[PDB]
Design a binder for this molecule. Structure first.
Ligand SMILES: CC(=O)N[C@H](C(=O)N1C[C@H](O)C[C@H]1C(=O)NCc1ccc(-c2scnc2C)cc1)C(C)(C)C
Lengths: 103, 141, 86
């Protein structure tokens, strides 16, 4: 079962899919391929929860019917600058304007 | 040109609405005129009597948006094998993002106000160019 | 293989190259980062979700869900869709 994700850190957002049976560590390998930082310099999160490497995405609550192509689930990402990990920080997207009167 | 053939050979059909829309079935009559038939609510089905060589298409009853039936625009009942009815699976197409956006804007703004919107004339014209059974019939021909 | 799509407000969206090439306009801007001075992140994020949706459900037997668009973003998303040709 494919799950569809946005892996997000600061103003970076990665759209990708993975298997429900795949692991947190395997998702770090995906991020490694794209942002060139090894798994040991990454933390992945579901909301405020630090995810453990050995767990499957499905176990961590990323399921095919909640992590959908048109509405993907969010995975937080934090990097270790040298010795210690930054805090998890995800910049929100911009706010839409007020609806025009005619809408 | 696009018209049902007057075969008079019965063919039973299941109209199965696997879309989230209210569905308007349209039978193309022997002169090529579109005839509307009773609507189907989302997720419902109807066993209906049609005929071999008849032509049908399917629309959103509210907006006339085009829908697919067995993955194409036109459905023609065929011979019933072993008494079994023909299945007509009605689904959403994958709309282009532009077309989907037009649908949502059309659903929120009365046609009187399409011109009041702050967009290029051509988008005003796209909004006003409502999904239209006639245009589609000409196209298909 | 990925490409980077950057919104007007500086959000960097990283998507599969083949998904981005869905847009004829992006294909042109790539012929591998693209900046969009007029498309804010709350619109471009949705554009990226559409790619995933289209690629996933195009010529698929499985039932197709409605692509959701909140009323507040629809006008801006219409404009971006028109520009990007999709
Ligand atoms: C011999 C022939 O061609 N007859 C035609 C005919 O019976 N037709 C044309 C189409 O093939 C369908 C068929 C017909 O009218 N069947 C009755 C019918 C009634 C309601 C419905 C529907 S559509 C959604 N809900 C319903 C109940 C479908 C079929 C008429 C009477 C219209 C000239």
């Amino acid at each position: 079962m494919d799950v569809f994700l946005m892996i997000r850190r600061h103003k970076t957002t990665i759209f990708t899919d993975a298997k429900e049976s795949s692991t947190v560590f395997e998702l770090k390998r995906i991020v490694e391929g794209i942002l060139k930082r090894p798994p040991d310099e990454q933390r992945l999160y579901k909301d405020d929860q630090l995810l453990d490497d050995g767990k499957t995405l499905g176990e961590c609550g990323f399921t095919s019917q909640t992590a959908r192509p048109q509405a993907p689930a969010t995975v937080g990402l934090a990097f270790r600058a040298d010795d210690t990990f930054e805090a998890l920080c995800i910049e929100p997207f911009s706010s839409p304007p007020e609806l025009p009167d005619v809408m | 040109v696009l018209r049902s053939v007057n075969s008079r050979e019965p063919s039973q059909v299941i109209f199965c609405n696997r879309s989230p829309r209210v569905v308007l079935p349209v039978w193309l009559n022997f002169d090529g005129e579109p005839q509307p038939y009773p609507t189907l609510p989302p997720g419902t089905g109807r066993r209906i009597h049609s005929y071999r060589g008849h032509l049908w298409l399917f629309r959103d009853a509210g907006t006339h948006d085009g829908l697919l039936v067995n993955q194409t625009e036109l459905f023609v009942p065929s011979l019933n094998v072993d008494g079994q009815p023909i299945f007509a699976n009605i689904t959403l197409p994958v709309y282009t993002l532009k077309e989907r956006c037009l649908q949502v804007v059309r659903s929120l703004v009365k046609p009187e106000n399409y011109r009041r919107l702050d967009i290029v004339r051509s988008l005003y014209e796209d909004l006003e160019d409502h999904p239209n059974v006639q245009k589609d019939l000409e196209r298909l021909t | 293989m990925y490409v980077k799509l950057i919104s007007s407000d500086g959000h960097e969206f990283i998507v599969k190259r083949e998904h981005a090439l869905t847009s004829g306009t992006i294909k042109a801007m790539l012929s591998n980062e693209v900046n969009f001075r007029e498309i804010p992140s709350h619109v471009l994020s949705k554009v990226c979700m559409y790619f995933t949706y289209k690629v996933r459900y195009t010529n698929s037997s499985t039932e197709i869900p409605e692509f959701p668009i909140a009323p507040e973003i629809a006008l801006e998303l219409l404009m971006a869709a028109n520009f990007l040709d999709c």
